[PDB]
Each structure stands twice: as structure tokens, then as C-alpha cells.
Curated annotation (Swiss-Prot), chain A:
The keyword DNA-binding belongs to this UniProt entry's keyword annotation: no
GO cellular component: ribonucleoprotein complex; ribosome
Membership in a protein family: Belongs to the universal ribosomal protein uS10 family.
Xref: Gene3D superfamilies: Ribosomal protein S10 domain
Gene (name only): rpsJ
Name used for this protein in its record: Small ribosomal subunit protein uS10
Keyword annotations from UniProtKB, A to Z: Ribonucleoprotein, Ribosomal protein, RNA-binding, rRNA-binding
Classification via InterPro entries: Ribosomal_uS10 (IPR001848), Ribosomal_uS10_CS (IPR018268), Ribosomal_uS10_dom (IPR027486), Ribosomal_uS10_dom_sf (IPR036838)
UniProt key word Ribosomal protein: yes
Any one Gene Ontology molecular-function term assigned to this protein's record: rRNA binding
Curated annotation (Swiss-Prot), chain B:
Function: Located at the top of the head of the 30S subunit, extending towards the 50S subunit, which it may contact in the 70S complex. Contacts several RNA helices of the 16S rRNA.
MF GO annotations: rRNA binding; structural constituent of ribosome
Provenance organism: Thermus thermophilus (strain ATCC 27634 / DSM 579 / HB8)
Recorded name of the encoding gene: rpsS
UniProt protein name: Small ribosomal subunit protein uS19
Gene Ontology biological process: ribosomal small subunit assembly; translation
GO cellular component: cytoplasm; small ribosomal subunit
Pfam family of the protein (one): Ribosomal_S19
Highest taxon, organism lineage: Bacteria
From Swiss-Prot, chain D:
Residues included from the entire protein: 31 to 143 of 292
KO phenotype (gene knockout): No visible phenotype. Not essential.
Family: Belongs to the class I-like SAM-binding methyltransferase superfamily. rRNA adenine N(6)-methyltransferase family. RsmA subfamily.
Residues reported to bind S-adenosyl-L-methionine: L1, G26, E47, D72, N97
Organism encoding this protein: Bacillus subtilis (strain 168)
Primary gene name: rsmA
Protein localization: Cytoplasm
Function: Specifically dimethylates two adjacent adenosines (A1518 and A1519) in the loop of a conserved hairpin near the 3'-end of 16S rRNA in the 30S particle. May play a critical role in biogenesis of 30S subunits.
Name of the protein in its database record: Ribosomal RNA small subunit methyltransferase A
UniProtKB/Swiss-Prot annotation, chain E:
Membrane-traversing stretches: none
The keyword Aminoacyl-tRNA synthetase appears for this protein: no
Domain KH type-2: residue ranges: 38-106
GO biological process assignments: translation
Known role: Binds the lower part of the 30S subunit head. Binds mRNA in the 70S ribosome, positioning it for translation.
Originating species: Thermus thermophilus (strain ATCC 27634 / DSM 579 / HB8)
Any Pfam family hit: Ribosomal_S3_C
One annotated Gene Ontology cellular component of this protein: cytosolic small ribosomal subunit
Subunit details: Part of the 30S ribosomal subunit. Forms a tight complex with proteins S10 and S14.
Assigned keywords, A-Z: Ribonucleoprotein, Ribosomal protein, RNA-binding, rRNA-binding
CDD domains hit by this protein: KH-II_30S_S3 (cd02412)
Name by which UniProt lists this protein: Small ribosomal subunit protein uS3
Amino acid sequence: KIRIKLRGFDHKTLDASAQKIVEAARRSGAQVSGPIPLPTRVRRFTVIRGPFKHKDSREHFELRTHNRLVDIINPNRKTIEQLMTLDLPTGVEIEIKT
Amino acid sequence: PRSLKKGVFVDDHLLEKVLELNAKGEKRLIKTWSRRSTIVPEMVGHTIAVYNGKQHVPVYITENMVGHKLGEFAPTRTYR
Amino acid sequence: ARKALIEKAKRTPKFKVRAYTRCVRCGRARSVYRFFGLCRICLRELAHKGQLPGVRKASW
Amino acid sequence: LIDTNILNRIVDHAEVTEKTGVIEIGPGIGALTEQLAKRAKKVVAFEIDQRLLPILKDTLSPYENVTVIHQDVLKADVKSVIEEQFQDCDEIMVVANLPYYVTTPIIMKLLEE
Amino acid sequence: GNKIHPIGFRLGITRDWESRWYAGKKQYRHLLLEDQRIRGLLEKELYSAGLARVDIERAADNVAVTVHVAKPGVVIGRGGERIRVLREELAKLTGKNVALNVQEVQNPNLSAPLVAQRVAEQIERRFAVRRAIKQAVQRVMESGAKGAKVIVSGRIGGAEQARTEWAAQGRVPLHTLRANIDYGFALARTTYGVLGVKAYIFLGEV
RNA sequence: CAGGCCUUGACAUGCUAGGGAACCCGGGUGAAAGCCUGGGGUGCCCCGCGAGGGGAGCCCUAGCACAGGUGCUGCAUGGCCGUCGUCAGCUCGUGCCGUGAGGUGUUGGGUUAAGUCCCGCAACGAGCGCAACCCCCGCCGUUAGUUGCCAGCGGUUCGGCCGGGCACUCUAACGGGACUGCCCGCGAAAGCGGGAGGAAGGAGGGGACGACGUCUGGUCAGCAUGGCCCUUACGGCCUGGGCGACACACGUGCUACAAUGCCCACUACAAAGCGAUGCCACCCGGCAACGGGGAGCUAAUCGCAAAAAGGUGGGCCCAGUUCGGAUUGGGGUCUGCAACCCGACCCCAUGAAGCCGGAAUCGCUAGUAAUCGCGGAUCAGCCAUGCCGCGGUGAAUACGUUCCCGGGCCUUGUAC
Ligand SMILES: [Zn+2]
């Protein structure tokens, strides 16, 4: 009944973190919903390459956020203590909501 | 224009001077820099030296010009 | 982009509407973005230098 | 300038170790001092030019062993520097190259002190 | 002309971001500003040490700064006191219990920034430009380094006219993504103005 | 720009004096900025019975090094960008030729988008180039099914609504697949014509990518920096004006000149984004923009959001018209301290020019042009009809290189 939010900028580290969490939870008794991929969100920034003029330059940049979902079912107490303890990679961001 | 709910806007610093001058006799050539204020029935018949940008221009307040703004009677650009 | 102009934007100007945004790196106020708080030139430089996490060249 | 292999031979004949410290006089460009830093532990240089010094300041930037002292070799309290810089090394050597005219007086001084 | 940044062209592959952390729109700007301030302070201070790279990590209300230095002797000090005050400085600047770390770069001849600052110092010391560039490229080539390229901006030898020097040897395939070309830029200030030096070094493929 | 003010100061690092030693709230004069002037205050150590002090960060005053300048030089520069041009070219090592400058390679025949490739050839290579490696779209597969989806089941107050399931679409990660690979024929080969299998066939369609160099190209007003120039002023602080003027000309666009149309009702089908001091569902008041109440959403859940051309029904009948909505007069709403100069929008009122446009000139080769709507950046609001993107409908034509413009390579005459 506990939902696990994974947000990231790099999909590789996000997948690694999700894999670690899912594996650890699966080892710890009850079954899990499994990694649910979610539509990534994209921010875009178009700029002028030149510092003064030539408004026909317009280099592009993107900032994309990748999303995951775990949704552990039938929570176990020792499973719970197993969470909040495993050190996560630097880039990845975690969220817990019942 | 104005929201008509919060009332016609007039600067306090000008309204106060106008009212106190009204109460005690009369004075001519009241110099001001407020281009934003609106004509009110409490200063009809007086003269205001409004700053148009380089020097205060005298304007004579009539009855008919009640509903208008200070600055529009002060030219800002000289053509020919 | 005078210094005095830089510090003038860092004080509450007695009303809300006088407040605006300046680049936190060079003090430009012409092409600043809310998300980063940088002008377009500084944004581009920092993006190229790879100092913006997750920001990358776009192509599609 | 001298061939790069001979200096190796002089340094070998100095029996320099990773533990010993060396006082070098008049590095000039800085061939010798380079080929010392490697096998040595602490290098101290007495040198006064202000002309070839920028070259010398550069050539030794890699290493952190070498230090430069802008003092006269003859107008120096050698005891003071030897005790001050070298509080850690086991033994101390001196390997240098002398500029002709003033070669005997330096050696005489270092020995009499 | 107008070649693009060789690093920005390879952010996705073969190169990695300097700053590695996530933050929402609510607090992206603040983190970026403090990161820039940290980088500025560190680059101003540790210049003598031969700075290479500054990595900034954040896990949970904490910062993990990694500093790549040619010679850790300068940064650490005689019994690890210098770093301490350095730490305190950062701790004072942004009160989130930073954790400074130092890594030494193997064979400093294979780091473009270091070559850049070296050549910049040579220029600042009124050296001969062309000879210095040949020496630098040869030195890079000695230590593997499948390609080397060095460019100097202009105003050579306090002349009235600016001119690019340029010198390279080996393979420098700027156009291939799977190149892993390390890039470095340095600025030299002299009595007759500013000079820019760029160094590219090509190390293998895939 | 006009006016009113200030001078180690709007901002940084240091000295010498004093001090009320973090400072907390009022009163005059004023457009403010400022200029004076009032009451309560010491918040940290050591010391001295305490009274007093020895001192800190700590703001004032006078002076010191000073800061400061969108002042000049882009022909002193860095950085960054534009153009030739995404054109295909620019070089080197070794070996050969020539006494030497030098040449060959890089020329010749053919073929490509290409100095791409083949053959010949005194050259064989290599580097920066092209191509490829990277991203998106197109087909399929494996992990993964919630906020996504609903084929086969059971209910359903019939809307995936519930119970239920990852079959399908999707959503993301990792792969497979296209390689002239197979066949027929033509060539000495690169290759060419035609077939088959395939989602795709002969660089599948776009993107990112810009060589040695040219233009004394652009930017000292993003920034950094050399040299001059000012420092009671060329510095700084406020109010107002101005950047928006107007006999005229030029450039880029928007809306039209109508019946393949216009107007009014009902009904459909998208993508890509954005949003917690924001989006704002729904109810009520008002013709309306909006106001009041008021849930739900850090978001595949909720909202912006009505998609519009399209389809159906009705009206208009060639008329400066139910074409067009400029211009002007009133009445309002919203943001904002403040809509005169100089905001947007709503309602009533009026209804300009304009009947497809000379010489001349621009864009476009297929999901293209043409046409229709939606989103985002900045943003209190917005003059945005701009810019960057997203999708809907969806063409016509290329016989040929004579000529116009701009390039590349190979050949010949007069100067460095
Ligand atoms: Zn900036």
C-alpha cells in the first residue's frame, strides 16, 4: 500500500536505483508491483548563440526528468526498516507516500 | 479607466493642500509635479502650476473639466 | 550593467512593481530566465561547460 | 646545456636516495635540479639572477620537493637553513655546478663552516 | 569558423556533468547560485595547487565536493590543517556541512586544463610562444595521448597586431562522438592585454 | 533631458582619531529622495566587592590608500557569433623525378551529395575534412503494468462505473532489423536496369555536427582586459518627461477586397506543453469581459482546454452588400501606489480605404507549398499581428541547361 517515487535527470542511475529498491524489497518477503515507467517531462530553452545579434542562430538545450514507480504491496516491518537505510546514488531523488 | 469600486484616485499630498487652502482664503499658482491626479469639485475655480517636464505650466480649473486628469492640459511635446 | 544598478535591484523598492530580475553572474536584465536566474549568454556558457545537471544539447 | 644522460651518471655517483636532501647551487635553467627531484626527497636552491628565474620557476612547477631561496650563497647562514628546512630527512648531500670564477671560495666556505 | 564547445557536444556520452544532483524548479536557482559561488572560491584559492576539476554532489541536505589536483601536498598541508580551514570556509559560506575530498590526477600531462594553465603561465612569464607550444605538444605526445592540439589567441609578443599561432600532432577527430577528447581553456593576463589558450587531447575511442 | 539633493559613497578590502559601541520606535519640512529634531536603548568576554573600567564584533564624524564610469578606442585584444558554405576542399610523412625554385601524390576516363568509389598512372599512405559513431520519426521483440489501457468474464444507478486482467493501444529502458544482403541481365571494376522477400531499397525522412582560411566582418552597451579621459562630476539618489513626435520615403508582417463565400445554432476527431504566494472544476449575480462563494491538484489522477478548419440545419442573393472593420463618441471590467502623454479586454454607437493590384521582386520539390487552430519563453498587465514549437486538411510541376545569379575544378595573357 506504499508508493515509491523515483525522480531523476539521468535515466541510467534512476534505473539502477529502482532495480536496487525492487530487488531488496523482493528479497524481503512480500511481492511488489514492479518498476512502472512514467512519461518523462521536458523543459526546452532556445537561445541566440551570438552575444549581440544574428537572431537566426538559436541553439537549443533540453532538461528532461525521468520518473519511476515501485508500489510495494503488503508492507513488512523488517522490509520497512530495510527502507530509509540503503544509501541512494547522488543524482537520484526518492519520495515515499502511502 | 478606474475600477469605480475603489473610487477616483487623487494624491493625498495634493488633496490635503487643496482642502486646507480652500478652508482659509485663497492662494494662486500652486506648484505641483503630480501628473496623475484627477479633477475634483473641491478645487474648481483655482489655478495649478503643473510640471510638464521642463517648467510648471499654469492651468485654470473650470467646472466643465471635472471628470478629467491633471496632465492632459499640460503639453509634453512642442511641434513647430 | 553598472554596479550601483546591480545593488539597486537587491532592495525592496517601497512597492512590488519596481522589483525585477537581474542575471546572478553578469548583472544583465535583458534575457534572464526564472528557472535558472541567468542571462542567455551565461546560460549557454555554463551549459557548454557541463555545470548544469541534466541540461544537454537538444536534437529531435 | 649538457647531454641528458651524463647528469644521470653524476646523480648516480651522488648515491641519492628517496630519503636524502640536496643543496644545489646555481641551477640556471634547471637541468640538474629536475633530474634530482625525481630520486631525491627535498631540494633547496640558492640562486640570484631575476633573468633565468622565470624559466626556473616554470621548470620546477611539476614537483613539490624543490624550493628556491633568493639569497647569496656566500652571504648565508648555512647552519640555519640546513637545520630549518631539513628536519625530516635522514642524510643530506650537496650536488651543484659552479660558475668558474667563484668555485674555490664556495667549497672552502662550506668546508670551514 | 565558430567551432562548438567539445565538452558540451559530448555531455550525453564519453563525458559526464561536473555537477551531479537533482532539484525542483522551487530550489534549482539557489543550488546553482551556491554551486557557482563554491566553484569561484575554490578556483580563486587552489590555483597554486594546479586545479583540474571540481565535482559537486548532493545526497540529502549535504554537499560532497571532490577536487582534482596535480599535487595534493599543497591542498592538504603539513598534517591536514589547511583543508580543515578550507572546509570551515565552505561551511561558513553555505551552512550544510560540506565534505571536502581530494583526488590526484595520474600523469598530469594528460589533463587539458593543466596544460592550459601551464602554457598560460609560460605566456605570462614573457616566454617564446611558438617554442613553448611545440614543447607542450611534444610533452603531451610522449605520454600516450593519441592526439594533441594547442591554440594561442593573439597579441603575440606585445605586437600591435593579434594573430593565432596554432600547433598540433596526432589524431584529433573533433567530429566523432565516440572520441573522449579532453578540453581545457586558460586566460593569461600580461602588461599588453589578455591571451586565450585552448588545448585538446585525444585519448582512445569507444 | 528638465528639476530637487549627496560626496572614502549605492557596493569591497585596510589605517588615525573620537562613540551615542548589536540600536528600536516617533515629529517637522517636502514630489519624493533627502535635510534637521525627538523618546526607549548595550544584546559579548576579562577585570575591579561594586562604583568604574581593559577590551571585541558595532554603527556615526573627520581625514588617509580609494572605490566608481552603458566615457573613447571592435584599426591594440580575449571570449562568442555571422558569411563564403555543410561548399568540398586544405595539408603532411616516406619514396620517386629536376642542378635548383619546385613537381608527383591532389592529374586523366567514369561515377557519386561529397578529394565518395573504381581503373589507369611513380607513388604508398596519413591528418583536418565528407561519411560513420549520437538524437527523433517509421516495423517488431523482452523486461514493466498506475494516475495508462479494456479484448474475453460478473455485476453496473450503463459513464472503465466497480470486481477483475496486462491480451491491444500506450508508457518508458534494452535490443533486433537495411547490409546492394538474394536472383536475372549489362560492364574490367566502382556500379546500372529489373525482380523477390520485407514496415522500409539502393545516402529510408529530419536533427546535432561547420576544415585550413577570407571578410582590418560584428560586439569595449552581456562579460573579461591594454592604453587614454572624469572624479562636488562624465559618480550616485528621487519626481516628471522621453525612448510612443510626424509634410514624407523604405523593409518585414497582419487583416481584407467575397458565393470554393459570410453569419448563427448542434455535433465530432490531435499533438506538444504549462501550473502550489499558480491552474483554477462547479454554483450564483451580471448581455458581457468579470465579481462572490467554492472543491481538486507538487500533478499519465486535477486544470488550463473551447481545438479550428471539418459535418449537419437555417439565413444572406452580387449590392461598397449580413464583404471589410479601420476611425471616432460614450458606458464599463482587470492588473497594478498610479492607465493623459502611453495597457489590455467587454457592451452600445458610427462605419474609412479597399473590385486582386506598373516597372520590378520573393518563397517553395511531398506530408512540401497553401490553409486552420493550440502551446511555451519573458511576463503584475501587455501594444505578441513578433519568436520558438506542436498538430489537422493537404496540392501543382520539373521537357531541358540557351539565357539571369552564385559557386567548384581544369586550361591561357600581364604584374609580385
Ligand atoms: Zn549573465
